[PDB]
Amino acid sequence: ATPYPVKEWLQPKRYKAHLMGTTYVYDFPELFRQASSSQWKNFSADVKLTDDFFISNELIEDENGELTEVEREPGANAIGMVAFKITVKTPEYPRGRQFVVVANDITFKIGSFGPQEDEFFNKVTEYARKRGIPRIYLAANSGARIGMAEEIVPLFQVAWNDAANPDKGFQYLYLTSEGMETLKKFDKENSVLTERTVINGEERFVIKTIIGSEDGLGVECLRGSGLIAGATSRAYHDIFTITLVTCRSVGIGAYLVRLGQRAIQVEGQPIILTGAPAINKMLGREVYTSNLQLGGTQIMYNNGVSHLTAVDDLAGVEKIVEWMSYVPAKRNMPVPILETKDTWDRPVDFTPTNDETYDVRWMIEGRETESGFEYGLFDKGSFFETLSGWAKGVVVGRARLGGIPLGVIGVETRTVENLIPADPANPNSAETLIQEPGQVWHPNSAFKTAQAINDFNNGEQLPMMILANWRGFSGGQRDMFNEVLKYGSFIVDALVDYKQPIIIYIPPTGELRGGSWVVVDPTINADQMEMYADVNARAGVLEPQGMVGIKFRREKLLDTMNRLDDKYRELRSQLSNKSLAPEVHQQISKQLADRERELLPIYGQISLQFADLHDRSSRMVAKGVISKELEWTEARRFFFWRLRRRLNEEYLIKRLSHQVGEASRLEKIARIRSWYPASVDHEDDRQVATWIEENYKTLDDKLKGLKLESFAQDLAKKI
Amino acid sequence: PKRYKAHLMGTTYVYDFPELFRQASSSQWKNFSADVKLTDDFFISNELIEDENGELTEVEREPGANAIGMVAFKITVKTPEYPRGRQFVVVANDITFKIGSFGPQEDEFFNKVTEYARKRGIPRIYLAANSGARIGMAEEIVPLFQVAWNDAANPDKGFQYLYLTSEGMETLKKFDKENSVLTERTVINGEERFVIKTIIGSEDGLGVECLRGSGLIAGATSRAYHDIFTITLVTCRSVGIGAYLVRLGQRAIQVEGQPIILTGAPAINKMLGREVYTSNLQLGGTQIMYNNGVSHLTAVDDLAGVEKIVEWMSYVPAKRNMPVPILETKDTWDRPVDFTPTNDETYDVRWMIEGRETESGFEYGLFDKGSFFETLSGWAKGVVVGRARLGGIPLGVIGVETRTVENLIPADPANPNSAETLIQEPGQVWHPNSAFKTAQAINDFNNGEQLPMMILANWRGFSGGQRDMFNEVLKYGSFIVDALVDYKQPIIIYIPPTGELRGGSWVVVDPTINADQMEMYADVNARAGVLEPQGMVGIKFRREKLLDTMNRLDDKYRELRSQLSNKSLAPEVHQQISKQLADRERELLPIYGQISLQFADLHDRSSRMVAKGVISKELEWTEARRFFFWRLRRRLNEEYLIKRLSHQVGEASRLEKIARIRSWYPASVDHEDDRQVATWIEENYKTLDDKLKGL
Ligand SMILES: Nc1ncnc2[nH]cnc12
């Protein structure tokens, strides 16, 4: 009979949790242990983990409401919101990093949000924020806590219109002196707001407002939803936030998942507002058959609300751990550099061809060809895609470049068949398929791009590379009506807001035209952006077919003919050098038309090539619009050292902006680069980075001392 | 001439706009105080131009000698809100200078102007009339290039590359343009052919350099919207960067038939090898941009367009961080609010806001008669966004349409199976568009306008259906929260009379979201609760509990209940009685369900809201105008004091600042009386001022 203690017996709560299809909240810490363990297996199997590599500390409020640490038997939570402070030693943080886990106890009042759960959830968020560590939220709730005064139930009355016929209706509810007394025989007068009265022989205290002695019935909870809605809203711009939906999320539940932005949905676990049964009655019909139709994975994932989906709670936890490996340990710390086995010093194997279609992910991480492995731009097996089920025109995810973490955005060259499911509420609604052309921003892909730039920026504080390859925005009616202009603008706002280095880069077979260029041009945020174009990329306000349709028309094509074709030329002269007889002019005009009707194609071809010669990177360098043109196969090596140099100098600027007399970026960049010895030329990225890194110790000193002179000069002289 | 050109375009000639502003300004007065006779210098417009150092400077010159396609004027006019005058610059595209194209210079000038406005904190108006980014080819290489055919005979069989002769090469050297093409010498039979590797041109503004400029200003306008009041009028057409410029400025009035697009119908039909679109208006006309919210407003023509810009400005400050422009008017603050909603029949939230004329007289609304200036009225009509004055105090106001919206949607021309679809949007419920409109308004009221705000909250919650959820309603609702967090002025949330605020709706407008600026108030005739009664009984007062209530308040039902449990009868007897138990339940159930509803409703009252301390006070509609006028005025005054304070060598926290201030008042002042506190502060701005510097 079970060789070991049945845990669902020792703690029935655990069984209720399992009965509702989710993990028992006090069992989630172990799930994070298991995932952190795998993190190491997948990175270095010969590593031997002790037991102190993972530490989970439960946090509960003390008397002054200050969260402290407590070790105690699970199932002892007085409120339905629990929290843990994890501090685990991971590959990118051998000495360990820390984060907090906030979770609804789904067994406690079905995970409902009451004033206490709310204030606790808020108290925890500020705990993380003040420390700068990530805030993980496991959501499994039933929303705001509802209720009625159960004390007024057993004793209210009905001022009927006609006592002997209740059907005729009533006029008001009230309590008898008896009831009015029954309340104090327990001290619950506040439970109601009455108004004295007498009648055909009796007392009548009409109820004007039922309030209830119990806390957590209505608006006070609503008040608490808002405290935490704005708290998360704020946290997202301050620390790495992320929510995992483990059973379901309703009301502020569905709003907290979104406000935290990054969200992982376990399949079968709905994210909803008002439930299907409620909607059905509302609509007076049996329209929906399951909450999944409202907030299931085919909605929230295809929608973009859920950045990822997981088959079960453990899978979802492993995805949170994986996501964190890219983020800094705490706010304002250098990005977690984890050198893999895929050295930076190598060529880039897979290369596109302006013919055969390709998956942009190949360029990103590589291809597993039937004859070996073609390495991509980034570290082998490092790409961690996100928002994969929404706006597939774009490809966003995290990655590592020579061990350096960064956000990556690519363009999907293949046409996406976005299939929209019919609306059950509309008897004559039809499943419909939208075809989204590759290399073109649509309302959804623009918004997605914006979302990604913002998520790399706010909590992750990451560098980012955009393999820009857009022919523009869709300008057709439908997409203009769907406000592609608004989502397109969001892109600019996101880049202006970005605080880490940005690399824009038109890849090989790529191009970046009119509308698309304006939203990614370095000038938008000169401080962090830089653009590069592959020697084999293209760029211009219009495409040749377009550029020609306006500045290389027929007449012009013909002028080129008369100048470059002997037959057409000599023919032109005969029609304009001598007065010919009608019969002869006709005879020759025909020979003209037929010649035009034979060279025209080739010549039209010639004009395109003329146009395409301006759309070259060489011109980009010439006009000073990019920083450099590059050799694709050499990109990895090049960017590896450009990012590392950029990052290294940025870290120095930030320090040189923590003291007193704030100076312009320029000056800080001056002061810094004068620290370099003649033996290292500024223009050399690998020369600078290596330098800064080899002297961090020394540098650290120079900066600290720089502050001392300040915080002691303004004082020494403050006479 | 120039004028004629511009008029062929359908727009007004650039140097004729100031005259239009002038005309509109004189109107403001005729509307304000008729009998006034402005003097020619009540308005002053100076054209701005670049100088040696490139630094903008004012000048007076020939209305038409601009060397670029971007023009700028510095308006300075005396208005009703600013008698001693207010300022603002106006940048525009010269539609006759290369079709308002954006060459690198038009760009760096525009950017230059924007920063000029941003540094002085003054509004930046933009008149859009352009063809987008400038395009061109190295025209000097067209008569000089050669084709190395596969076979000079039968040229139709291809070519290998373009080059320049030894001559053409000298043709460039001569006219000092040897830098128009990057080339590479070759050794064919006869002489050398410079193989064209890439063309550059001698003229500037042919491609990418143009795009750079486009970007530079895209981020410049993006930045300006968060720094100064920005607005733009679409006078002729706006293409590409022009259209992105209209959006990035956020505020936009669109002149009818003046399209805003990214690519013309021609290019697109061409793009789809078929005659899809007939007009550019189908792509960016007011039926497109106005209905979708990109164009807050539309004007019949340029003058009307400019008028609306001037009317919009009468609500915003003169320069960044300037006290909102108070403008007391005929309709004084001390009066009751007339129009009142009635759960019975339907109403228009506007009547509540601006009053309505009745076949008896003018029923005054909550705000100053005639001061409502609605915007974004062609998009998401579930919400009513606008600006008005409360006893002269300007402020953004958001109300809720209670009447169903019949959203009509045009078929898609490029999809031959498309059909005009009519989506009905129910009242008092957020949908993706209305939630989005709500956040946009809050964002626009806060960024350049810097206005206080009152939201007459009346929402059953968000749409939970599949469609509205599939369409991301969850994303736009959250936008609202972010907008409130960012708010920098005083906010007032007021659940109006026949109104309510439930589970999902209440969470995005709670005062705790931004304790520093918000406050909530509920009418004594309003409702609130996580669930609506129907929903509450649905869970907490079901069939069973209902029966338990019948068995307690209905004598015969208990009689019957008793018999079946206090004596043990014969089969036929137990059957008969059980039957009559049912007949009784199917008689009272209805009216008893009514009771459970009433029972639930008594929990959703403002009194409980006060009891719980979730609102500030319950109020009476008719008496709201009076209450709010002094609460706002009062808070405006304390905020003023909060800033003058904070601004010192020890900045503390709200609670603290607001407490060192309130500790300055006379001990006899009631920190709870708004009129008295405002009155005192105003009577002591200097006395208060002295004390400040006294630290
Ligand atoms: N934007 C533009 N610039 C220059 N010439 C053009 N011809 C048509 N559109 C143009």
XYZ file of N, CA, C and O in Angstrom, chain A residues 146-149 153-154 156 158 166 207-211 215 217 220 222-223 226-227 233-234 255 258-259 271 279 288 293 300 303 390 422 424 447 473 477-478 480 483 485-487 489 493 496 517-518 521 523-524 547 551-552 556 563-564 602-603 606 610 613-614 616 618-619 622-623 625, chain B residues 135-139 142-143 145-147 149 155-156 197-200 204 206 208-209 211-212 215-216 222-223 244 247 260-262 277 282-283 289 292 411 413 462 464 466 469-470 472 474-476 478 482 506-507 510 512-513 530 536 539-540 549 552 591 595 599 602-603 607-608 611-612:
560
model
N -16.401 37.202 -4.468
C -17.780 37.662 -4.389
C -18.493 37.101 -3.166
O -18.061 36.116 -2.569
N -19.595 37.733 -2.790
C -20.326 37.262 -1.634
C -21.456 38.183 -1.240
O -21.578 39.301 -1.740
N -22.298 37.687 -0.343
C -23.426 38.445 0.163
C -23.435 38.254 1.665
O -22.791 37.338 2.176
N -24.144 39.120 2.379
C -24.216 39.014 3.829
C -25.085 37.815 4.170
O -26.303 37.873 4.050
N -29.614 36.932 5.274
C -30.383 35.932 4.547
C -31.416 35.243 5.433
O -32.611 35.268 5.149
N -30.971 34.632 6.535
C -31.943 33.957 7.387
C -32.978 34.847 8.064
O -33.902 34.343 8.702
N -34.576 38.258 6.650
C -35.140 39.448 6.017
C -36.616 39.201 5.746
O -37.056 38.058 5.732
N -40.434 40.572 3.580
C -40.923 41.135 2.337
C -42.232 41.904 2.464
O -43.308 41.327 2.660
N -48.276 36.804 -3.011
C -46.905 37.267 -3.233
C -46.643 37.576 -4.705
O -45.859 38.470 -5.041
N -34.502 48.036 5.011
C -33.093 47.941 4.630
C -32.819 48.909 3.474
O -33.471 48.858 2.425
N -31.873 49.817 3.693
C -31.514 50.794 2.671
C -30.240 50.378 1.959
O -30.014 50.758 0.809
N -29.415 49.596 2.646
C -28.174 49.112 2.078
C -27.608 47.961 2.905
O -27.323 48.118 4.086
N -27.456 46.797 2.279
C -26.887 45.640 2.951
C -25.382 45.794 2.800
O -24.885 45.968 1.695
N -24.661 45.736 3.915
C -23.220 45.892 3.893
C -22.456 44.632 4.256
O -21.418 44.352 3.674
N -15.743 40.649 5.427
C -14.976 41.436 4.454
C -14.700 40.606 3.184
O -14.473 39.392 3.259
N -16.722 41.026 -0.039
C -17.953 40.747 -0.773
C -18.060 41.408 -2.143
O -18.610 40.819 -3.081
N -14.761 46.325 -2.437
C -13.503 46.401 -1.709
C -12.492 45.498 -2.406
O -11.290 45.743 -2.356
N -12.754 44.811 -5.766
C -12.520 45.531 -7.003
C -11.364 46.529 -6.758
O -10.430 46.645 -7.554
N -11.444 47.234 -5.637
C -10.444 48.212 -5.216
C -9.080 47.531 -5.216
O -8.067 48.117 -5.592
N -7.556 46.779 -8.828
C -6.879 47.947 -9.348
C -5.546 48.246 -8.694
O -4.647 48.785 -9.336
N -5.402 47.924 -7.416
C -4.127 48.187 -6.759
C -3.055 47.337 -7.406
O -1.937 47.804 -7.628
N 1.581 46.702 -13.853
C 1.779 47.635 -14.946
C 3.100 48.358 -14.747
O 3.873 48.537 -15.685
N 3.350 48.766 -13.509
C 4.570 49.482 -13.156
C 5.783 48.567 -13.137
O 6.861 48.947 -13.594
N -6.233 39.972 -16.549
C -5.585 41.262 -16.710
C -4.194 41.326 -16.116
O -3.383 42.143 -16.526
N -1.740 39.695 -18.763
C -1.411 40.642 -19.811
C -0.511 41.780 -19.306
O 0.521 42.056 -19.895
N -0.893 42.434 -18.217
C -0.094 43.522 -17.668
C 1.348 43.112 -17.419
O 2.259 43.941 -17.499
N -7.956 31.564 -19.992
C -7.686 32.923 -19.513
C -8.946 33.691 -19.900
O -9.086 34.091 -21.051
N -22.171 34.260 -20.026
C -22.432 34.886 -21.301
C -23.690 34.265 -21.912
O -24.587 34.990 -22.346
N -21.956 29.431 -26.287
C -20.638 28.824 -26.066
C -20.790 27.530 -25.273
O -21.695 27.428 -24.445
N -13.403 28.147 -25.626
C -13.811 28.880 -26.808
C -13.584 30.365 -26.593
O -13.515 31.132 -27.553
N -5.731 32.976 -27.081
C -4.628 33.705 -26.476
C -3.239 33.537 -27.103
O -2.394 34.424 -26.988
N -3.459 34.934 -30.664
C -3.747 36.320 -30.394
C -2.520 37.120 -30.004
O -2.439 38.310 -30.280
N 1.412 34.022 -33.120
C 0.760 35.254 -33.550
C 1.615 36.072 -34.517
O 2.841 36.093 -34.401
N -14.490 30.796 -37.082
C -15.801 31.433 -37.087
C -16.286 31.812 -35.676
O -15.955 31.146 -34.681
N -18.959 31.851 -32.982
C -20.158 31.102 -32.582
C -21.400 31.958 -32.328
O -22.530 31.495 -32.496
N 2.603 45.514 -34.874
C 2.316 45.487 -33.447
C 3.229 44.457 -32.768
O 3.776 44.691 -31.689
N 4.873 48.491 -45.720
C 3.651 48.179 -45.017
C 2.589 47.885 -46.055
O 2.693 48.282 -47.203
N -6.696 48.809 -48.688
C -7.801 49.295 -47.869
C -7.942 48.616 -46.513
O -7.900 49.265 -45.472
N -8.138 47.306 -46.549
C -8.319 46.496 -45.357
C -7.331 46.795 -44.229
O -7.737 47.051 -43.098
N -5.337 49.407 -43.937
C -5.289 50.825 -43.593
C -6.469 51.072 -42.680
O -6.432 51.913 -41.784
N -5.797 50.100 -39.205
C -4.821 50.952 -38.551
C -3.367 50.516 -38.528
O -2.692 50.645 -37.498
N -1.135 52.016 -39.632
C -0.373 53.234 -39.373
C -0.095 53.440 -37.899
O 0.949 53.975 -37.534
N -1.032 53.018 -37.057
C -0.880 53.156 -35.618
C 0.147 52.168 -35.095
O 1.080 52.549 -34.392
N -0.024 50.894 -35.430
C 0.915 49.888 -34.961
C 2.293 50.148 -35.546
O 3.306 49.834 -34.925
N 3.546 53.092 -36.064
C 4.125 54.170 -35.287
C 4.664 53.650 -33.974
O 5.681 54.138 -33.489
N 8.072 54.603 -31.307
C 8.024 54.878 -29.874
C 8.894 53.869 -29.111
O 9.629 54.231 -28.194
N 12.624 54.677 -29.656
C 13.025 55.889 -28.960
C 13.276 55.567 -27.493
O 14.196 56.097 -26.872
N 11.780 51.580 -44.126
C 13.032 52.207 -43.692
C 12.858 53.288 -42.627
O 13.614 53.352 -41.653
N 11.870 54.147 -42.817
C 11.651 55.226 -41.878
C 11.494 54.792 -40.414
O 11.973 55.484 -39.515
N 15.326 53.558 -39.076
C 16.536 54.347 -39.307
C 17.218 54.793 -38.030
O 16.598 55.386 -37.158
N 18.757 57.242 -37.023
C 18.491 58.575 -36.508
C 17.345 58.649 -35.502
O 17.270 59.589 -34.710
N 16.467 57.656 -35.518
C 15.361 57.643 -34.586
C 15.876 57.720 -33.149
O 15.301 58.432 -32.333
N 10.469 52.465 -59.383
C 11.322 53.605 -59.696
C 11.296 53.905 -61.195
O 11.345 55.059 -61.618
N 10.347 57.236 -63.440
C 11.405 58.010 -64.053
C 12.175 57.362 -65.205
O 13.272 57.796 -65.549
N 11.584 56.328 -65.803
C 12.187 55.658 -66.943
C 11.066 55.045 -67.785
O 11.016 53.831 -68.027
N 11.445 57.541 -72.781
C 12.810 57.526 -72.286
C 13.490 56.233 -72.700
O 14.668 56.208 -73.030
N 19.668 55.741 -79.163
C 21.072 55.939 -78.839
C 21.893 54.647 -78.804
O 23.074 54.663 -79.151
N 21.287 53.529 -78.408
C 22.044 52.277 -78.331
C 21.721 51.165 -79.344
O 22.320 50.087 -79.276
N 13.773 43.708 -73.569
C 15.173 43.738 -73.153
C 15.512 45.109 -72.579
O 16.183 45.219 -71.546
N 15.044 46.153 -73.258
C 15.311 47.510 -72.808
C 14.629 47.792 -71.471
O 15.208 48.452 -70.603
N 16.802 46.437 -69.143
C 17.975 47.282 -68.967
C 17.720 48.420 -67.990
O 18.592 48.753 -67.189
N 19.365 49.517 -64.288
C 19.871 50.868 -64.096
C 19.395 51.331 -62.709
O 20.166 51.862 -61.900
N 20.992 49.777 -59.597
C 22.376 50.112 -59.302
C 22.472 51.239 -58.282
O 23.543 51.522 -57.755
N 21.350 51.881 -57.995
C 21.346 52.947 -57.004
C 21.012 52.340 -55.647
O 21.450 52.827 -54.607
N 22.100 50.152 -53.899
C 23.212 49.355 -53.402
C 23.852 49.915 -52.152
O 23.865 51.123 -51.927
N 26.861 50.216 -51.436
C 27.979 51.087 -51.776
C 27.477 52.515 -51.776
O 28.205 53.442 -51.410
N 26.226 52.694 -52.194
C 25.652 54.028 -52.203
C 25.311 54.436 -50.768
O 25.415 55.611 -50.398
N 28.349 55.622 -49.281
C 28.625 56.885 -49.959
C 27.825 58.046 -49.392
O 28.366 59.122 -49.144
N 26.532 57.821 -49.186
C 25.653 58.851 -48.649
C 25.614 58.907 -47.116
O 24.840 59.663 -46.540
N 24.473 56.801 -44.801
C 23.252 56.351 -44.156
C 23.429 55.090 -43.313
O 22.570 54.766 -42.507
N 12.248 61.205 -54.794
C 12.889 60.146 -55.565
C 13.531 60.672 -56.846
O 13.126 61.702 -57.395
N 14.544 59.955 -57.313
C 15.218 60.344 -58.530
C 16.323 59.380 -58.886
O 16.751 58.581 -58.057
N 16.781 59.452 -60.129
C 17.865 58.602 -60.596
C 18.999 59.526 -60.970
O 18.775 60.719 -61.129
N 20.214 59.000 -61.078
C 21.334 59.840 -61.504
C 20.980 60.090 -62.961
O 21.266 59.281 -63.842
N 20.315 61.207 -63.195
C 19.862 61.563 -64.518
C 21.005 61.795 -65.504
O 20.820 61.649 -66.710
N 22.092 58.596 -67.661
C 21.162 58.036 -68.637
C 21.627 58.206 -70.103
O 21.425 57.323 -70.952
N 22.231 59.356 -70.426
C 22.653 59.441 -71.823
C 24.101 58.958 -72.023
O 24.587 58.884 -73.151
N 25.586 55.850 -70.391
C 25.846 54.412 -70.191
C 25.728 53.468 -71.402
O 24.904 53.681 -72.298
N 26.548 52.412 -71.389
C 26.584 51.408 -72.458
C 26.195 49.992 -72.008
O 26.403 49.611 -70.851
N 25.651 49.209 -72.933
C 25.241 47.841 -72.646
C 26.148 46.780 -73.290
O 26.215 46.660 -74.515
N 26.204 43.692 -74.421
C 25.318 42.596 -74.786
C 26.046 41.258 -74.878
O 27.277 41.206 -74.932
N 20.363 41.788 -79.774
C 20.532 42.331 -78.418
C 19.451 41.772 -77.512
O 19.552 41.820 -76.283
N 18.412 41.239 -78.136
C 17.298 40.675 -77.395
C 17.683 39.428 -76.602
O 16.872 38.917 -75.832
N 29.660 49.544 -61.361
C 29.414 48.657 -60.234
C 28.277 49.182 -59.360
O 27.582 48.411 -58.714
N 28.087 50.496 -59.353
C 27.014 51.123 -58.581
C 26.871 52.612 -58.916
O 27.860 53.338 -59.017
N 25.632 53.052 -59.101
C 25.348 54.441 -59.437
C 24.970 55.267 -58.209
O 24.200 54.813 -57.353
N 25.496 56.489 -58.150
C 25.248 57.379 -57.030
C 24.564 58.685 -57.418
O 23.608 59.095 -56.772
N 21.472 65.407 -54.855
C 21.217 64.798 -53.565
C 19.716 64.598 -53.419
O 18.914 65.318 -54.017
N 18.017 61.276 -53.666
C 17.578 60.319 -54.673
C 16.983 59.066 -54.050
O 16.105 58.433 -54.646
N 17.972 56.550 -50.211
C 18.192 56.341 -48.792
C 18.421 57.598 -47.978
O 17.867 57.723 -46.881
N 19.223 58.526 -48.501
C 19.481 59.770 -47.780
C 18.140 60.442 -47.490
O 17.993 61.169 -46.503
N 15.336 58.723 -47.013
C 14.696 57.905 -46.013
C 15.263 58.252 -44.650
O 14.517 58.350 -43.674
N 16.574 58.464 -44.586
C 17.199 58.831 -43.328
C 16.405 60.011 -42.790
O 15.860 59.964 -41.684
N 13.175 59.176 -41.305
C 13.288 58.601 -39.984
C 13.583 59.667 -38.948
O 12.892 59.756 -37.940
N 14.610 60.476 -39.195
C 14.983 61.545 -38.276
C 13.768 62.311 -37.770
O 13.670 62.592 -36.582
N 7.648 61.858 -32.748
C 7.327 60.897 -31.705
C 7.684 61.532 -30.378
O 6.913 61.491 -29.423
N 8.870 62.123 -30.335
C 9.366 62.764 -29.134
C 8.598 64.024 -28.762
O 8.438 64.337 -27.586
N 2.858 58.885 -41.861
C 3.375 58.474 -40.573
C 3.511 59.691 -39.678
O 3.417 59.594 -38.452
N 0.179 60.445 -37.990
C -0.065 59.576 -36.841
C 0.806 59.895 -35.635
O 0.307 60.012 -34.518
N -4.777 60.125 -46.971
C -3.561 59.911 -46.197
C -3.224 58.472 -46.533
O -3.963 57.569 -46.171
N -2.130 58.255 -47.253
C -1.757 56.898 -47.631
C -0.269 56.640 -47.632
O 0.536 57.532 -47.388
N 0.079 55.398 -47.930
C 1.465 54.966 -47.969
C 1.871 54.579 -49.378
O 3.052 54.527 -49.697
N -8.339 49.183 -57.071
C -8.797 50.471 -56.558
C -8.996 51.590 -57.576
O -8.162 51.796 -58.462
N -10.127 55.529 -51.342
C -10.549 54.247 -50.798
C -9.501 53.747 -49.823
O -9.809 52.973 -48.927
N -8.267 54.202 -50.009
C -7.144 53.799 -49.175
C -6.936 54.680 -47.937
O -6.581 54.183 -46.870
N -9.730 56.836 -42.626
C -8.979 57.384 -41.510
C -9.814 58.004 -40.382
O -9.362 58.085 -39.237
N -11.591 54.992 -38.501
C -10.658 54.190 -37.735
C -9.929 54.887 -36.605
O -9.061 54.290 -35.968
N -16.920 46.544 -47.633
C -16.336 45.301 -48.126
C -14.904 45.563 -48.551
O -14.496 46.719 -48.705
N -12.356 45.551 -51.354
C -12.261 45.539 -52.823
C -11.346 44.448 -53.381
O -11.667 43.817 -54.393
N -15.868 44.500 -19.694
C -15.371 44.323 -21.051
C -16.143 43.218 -21.747
O -16.919 42.521 -21.117
N -16.558 39.680 -23.129
C -15.915 38.406 -22.867
C -16.125 37.381 -23.959
O -15.590 36.273 -23.889
N -16.075 35.456 -27.705
C -14.932 34.915 -28.434
C -14.266 35.925 -29.338
O -13.049 36.104 -29.303
N -12.516 38.778 -27.666
C -11.354 38.247 -26.949
C -10.304 37.856 -27.976
O -9.105 38.081 -27.785
N -10.761 37.272 -29.074
C -9.846 36.891 -30.117
C -9.184 38.168 -30.617
O -7.990 38.191 -30.897
N -8.142 40.667 -29.152
C -7.315 41.332 -28.166
C -7.896 42.387 -27.206
O -7.157 43.264 -26.772
N -8.214 42.353 -24.305
C -7.384 42.252 -23.110
C -6.143 43.126 -23.184
O -5.588 43.509 -22.154
N -5.701 43.420 -24.405
C -4.533 44.264 -24.627
C -4.884 45.744 -24.517
O -4.148 46.521 -23.914
N -6.011 46.131 -25.099
C -6.432 47.524 -25.065
C -6.915 47.965 -23.670
O -6.757 49.128 -23.283
N -5.673 46.899 -20.845
C -4.456 47.149 -20.091
C -3.833 48.485 -20.478
O -3.206 49.130 -19.651
N -2.042 51.641 -18.092
C -0.764 52.297 -18.333
C -0.934 53.802 -18.510
O -0.110 54.578 -18.032
N -14.438 48.029 -13.372
C -13.909 48.750 -12.201
C -12.398 48.674 -12.014
O -11.768 49.645 -11.600
N -11.810 47.529 -12.324
C -10.384 47.370 -12.129
C -9.478 48.296 -12.933
O -8.365 48.588 -12.504
N -9.634 52.296 -11.004
C -9.644 52.434 -9.564
C -8.611 53.486 -9.186
O -7.562 53.586 -9.807
N -6.516 53.525 -6.812
C -5.239 53.004 -6.338
C -4.231 52.832 -7.463
O -3.041 52.708 -7.209
N -4.717 52.821 -8.701
C -3.855 52.703 -9.875
C -2.893 53.884 -9.896
O -1.725 53.729 -10.239
N -18.767 43.394 -8.122
C -18.037 42.512 -9.012
C -18.968 41.878 -10.050
O -18.599 41.722 -11.216
N -24.935 37.544 -9.617
C -24.790 37.242 -8.196
C -25.737 36.128 -7.715
O -25.304 35.169 -7.080
N -25.056 32.523 -8.614
C -24.092 31.736 -7.869
C -24.433 31.603 -6.393
O -24.380 30.512 -5.830
N -24.784 32.728 -5.780
C -25.063 32.785 -4.357
C -26.514 32.800 -3.902
O -26.777 33.063 -2.736
N -35.976 30.148 1.389
C -36.545 31.455 1.700
C -38.074 31.419 1.607
O -38.768 32.193 2.259
N -39.552 29.972 4.622
C -39.416 30.860 5.777
C -40.345 32.080 5.743
O -40.655 32.657 6.780
N -41.607 35.653 -8.562
C -41.499 36.750 -7.612
C -40.391 36.560 -6.552
O -39.826 37.539 -6.053
N -37.014 38.840 -5.507
C -36.514 39.167 -4.178
C -34.997 38.961 -4.100
O -34.269 39.831 -3.602
N -32.415 41.713 -3.235
C -31.502 41.440 -2.146
C -30.055 41.716 -2.574
O -29.273 42.285 -1.815
N -29.137 45.599 -3.152
C -28.926 46.375 -1.928
C -27.484 46.323 -1.447
O -27.132 46.955 -0.457
N -26.649 45.573 -2.153
C -25.242 45.452 -1.791
C -24.408 46.363 -2.679
O -23.289 46.732 -2.342
N -23.528 53.683 -0.555
C -23.372 53.639 0.900
C -22.392 52.567 1.305
O -21.630 52.738 2.255
N -22.415 51.447 0.595
C -21.470 50.391 0.913
C -20.111 50.881 0.419
O -19.094 50.671 1.075
N -18.938 52.951 3.124
C -18.667 52.051 4.234
C -17.330 51.329 4.058
O -16.575 51.166 5.014
N -17.049 50.908 2.826
C -15.813 50.196 2.509
C -14.639 51.133 2.284
O -13.501 50.693 2.233
